[PDB]
């Protein structure tokens, strides 16, 4: 598009970073992440701890889970597995429960340094409506 709808100055910081990465890298991961940054808050539904566990429970373990949305906690998920999640935002319950399981929490700018081309990443988004 042309301008992000958000008034967050750090969300405009991330759009500036992923505009540069989408232009100067063949990886369609950067183009997809940049498209979802421009999208509104309703079009980025929250993703729960239970939903990122099912997409991990296959042979997709040891991959950096990337969710360009907020991460919410599920009280019905009794045990959290070890997992590295990069997201826009984390709730306090979610952040504590990844850290209790031995996992790590990343931001999208820490993702861009580590995996600029989006290598070995599991991209997820939440339920629409």
């Amino acid at each position: 598009r042309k301008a992000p709808k958000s008034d967050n100055v750090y969300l405009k910081l991330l759009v500036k970073l992923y505009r540069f990465l989408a232009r100067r890298t063949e990886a369609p991961f950067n183009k997809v992440v940049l498209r979802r940054l421009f999208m509104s808050r309703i079009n980025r539904p929250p993703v729960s701890l239970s939903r990122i566990a099912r997409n991990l429970k296959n042979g997709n373990e040891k991959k950096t889970v990337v969710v360009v949305a907020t991460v919410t906690d599920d009280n019905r998920l009794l045990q959290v597995p070890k997992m590295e999640v990069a997201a826009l935002r984390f709730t306090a319950k979610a952040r504590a429960r990844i850290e209790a399981a031995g996992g790590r929490t990343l931001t999208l700018d820490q993702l861009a340094l580590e995996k600029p081309t989006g290598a070995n990443t599991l991209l997820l988004r939440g339920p629409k409506n």
Binding site: V9, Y10, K12, L13
Partner: protein
């Protein structure tokens, strides 16, 4: 937070801005190489900066801002005396502003050039005004 400062400076409020209707904006801050408010020449939004100033006694100095003396506003600027010979002062910019952005080097040389030119013009006006007696 150098970019976050710039976003606040550019798009919310800056006490040094002068908005003109002629398609250009001006910075009133005395430590700016050009009078214009842009990203390259805003000294507040650039942690590393250079500026050429002229003293009332007639001496031209070069000012240096580093990221380390940022939290200390009284010690923002290193003041270095520039040579009166025009070529040695241009070289003194190049050695001192080494490994800087080339915008700062190119505009400090322009600011040095205009300051010397005004000083020569200032002496020619004063000589003619003394002769004219008006």
């Amino acid at each position: 937070s150098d970019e976050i400062v710039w976003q606040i400076i550019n798009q919310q409020f800056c006490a040094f801005k002068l908005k003109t209707t002629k398609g250009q904006n001006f910075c009133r801050n005395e430590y700016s190489v050009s009078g214009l408010c842009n990203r390259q020449s805003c000294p507040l939004a650039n942690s590393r900066y250079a500026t050429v100033r002229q003293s009332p006694k007639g001496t031209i100095y070069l000012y240096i801002k580093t990221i380390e003396r940022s939290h200390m506003p009284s010690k923002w600027w290193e003041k270095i005396k520039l040579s009166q010979n025009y070529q040695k002062a241009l070289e003194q910019i190049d050695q001192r502003l080494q490994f800087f952005p080339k915008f700062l080097i190119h505009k400090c040389k322009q600011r040095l050039t205009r300051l010397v030119q005004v000083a020569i013009r200032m002496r020619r006006i004063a000589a003619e005004e003394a002769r004219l007696g008006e």
